[PDB]
């Protein structure tokens, strides 16, 4: 099973196999549905370890290999690094850059300003996270890779504090498509032509990014509050769009509404999105806006 990305093809033989003896598991990280994930170390190098359960289908095996190949071929500061794999021992491992800040949705929810920590986050921290991820999306778009599942839950942070860098950290949806059901589709992150016609383009990710933006500036709320998948599908196809997150500056909301343009051709590409986010970081009225302090 081969993988093509950019102007090169790669094989399982291209994966950097790490000697199993050199790998130590330290703690579980909230192992997702399929496959457990651990914090671990390579004889010291800090890693996240994605495991393939030994009880799996041949198809599971292939998806796992594909995931390894996809992540290993990326080379960008806002895409989580692959340190290597261990496929020659069971259970099989994929080794990733450990992102000590955890996932973005948890970070936002746990770092919301409160009367005890009213200074935890500012508008500028949110814009930098947005910029980081948009930079990762731009690298994907210019390499003609469509992510298909841009969302806070799939983004990671290097550290909780001020120097944090956000990176795209999961590629499970793109993987499944390279190789399912309605109730598993990330409907709330998808533009009309995607869930209607099954058409995906770099403009598919633009729409999702807009939704990611709302997640970020809402500080980790679920998109379309109180609506189910189908209700959202009908809301959005009828021209319905989310309101601004609480206290959200107008210039930021305008980026969202441009990302959610009904026609893909009317939506910005990530180069434009980046420029608009940068202009936002420069506007004192944007970055001097206070975030809501939840009680
Ligand atoms: C240290 C650390 N803490 C995390 C918490 C528990 O979710 C809190 O933010 S994720 C995390 C953490 C740190 N670095 C990683 N390289 C990582 O990768 C896993 C495969 C991952 C990548 C994603 F893009 C999204 C979710 C997950 N998870 N998270 C749990 C299972 N898969 C997780």
UniProtKB/Swiss-Prot annotation:
Q: Give the UniProt tissue specificity note.
A: Expressed in brain and CNS. Also expressed in the small intestine and testis, but not in normal lymphoid cells.
User: What does changing residue 145 to C do?
Assistant: In NBLST3; somatic mutation
Q: Where is the Protein kinase domain?
A: 23-286
Q: Where does ATP bind?
A: 31, 50, 97-99, 170
UniProt PTM = Phosphorylated at tyrosine residues by autocatalysis, which activates kinase activity. In cells not stimulated by a ligand, receptor protein tyrosine phosphatase beta and zeta complex (PTPRB/PTPRZ1) dephosphorylates ALK at the sites in ALK that are undergoing autophosphorylation through autoactivation. N-glycosylated.
- Tell me the outcome of changing residue 175 to Q: In NBLST3; constitutively activated; retained in the endoplasmic reticulum and Golgi compartments
Upon changing residue 71 to N, the result is: In NBLST3; somatic mutation
Function, as annotated, reads: Neuronal receptor tyrosine kinase that is essentially and transiently expressed in specific regions of the central and peripheral nervous systems and plays an important role in the genesis and differentiation of the nervous system. Also acts as a key thinness protein involved in the resistance to weight gain: in hypothalamic neurons, controls energy expenditure acting as a negative regulator of white adipose tissue lipolysis and sympathetic tone to fine-tune energy homeostasis.
User: By what name is this protein known?
Assistant: ALK tyrosine kinase receptor
């Amino acid at each position: 099973p081969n993988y093509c990305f950019a102007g090169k093809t790669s094989s399982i033989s291209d994966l950097k196999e790490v000697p199993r003896k050199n790998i130590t598991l330290i703690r579980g990280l909230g192992h997702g549905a399929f496959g457990e994930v651990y914090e671990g170390q390579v004889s010291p190098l800090q890693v996240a370890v994605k495991t393939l359960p030994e009880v799996c289908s041949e198809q599971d095996e292939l998806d796992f290999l594909m995931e390894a190949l996809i992540i290993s071929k990326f080379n960008h500061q806002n895409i989580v690094r692959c340190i290597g794999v261990s496929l020659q021992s069971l259970p099989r491992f994929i080794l990733m850059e450990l992102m000590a800040g955890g996932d973005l949705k948890s970070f936002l929810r746990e770092t919301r300003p409160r009367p005890s920590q009213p200074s935890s986050l500012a508008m500028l921290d949110l814009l930098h996270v947005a910029r980081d991820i948009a930079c990762g999306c731009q690298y994907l778009e210019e390499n003609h890779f469509i992510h298909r599942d841009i969302a806070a839950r799939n983004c990671l942070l290097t550290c909780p504090g001020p120097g944090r860098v956000a990176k795209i950290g999961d590629f499970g949806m793109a993987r499944d498509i390279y190789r399912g059901g309605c109730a598993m589709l990330p409907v709330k992150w998808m533009p009309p032509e995607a869930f209607m016609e099954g058409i995906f383009t770099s403009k598919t990710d633009t729409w999702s990014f807009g939704v990611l933006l709302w997640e970020i500036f809402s500080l980790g709320y679920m998109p379309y509050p109180s609506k189910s998948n189908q209700e959202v599908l009908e809301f959005v196809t009828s021209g319905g769009r989310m309101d601004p997150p609480k206290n959200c500056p107008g210039p930021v909301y305008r980026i969202m509404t441009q990302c959610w343009q009904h026609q893909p051709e009317d939506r910005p590409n990530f180069a434009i999105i980046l420029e608009r986010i940068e202009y936002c970081t420069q506007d004192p009225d944007v970055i001097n806006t206070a975030l809501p302090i939840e009680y």
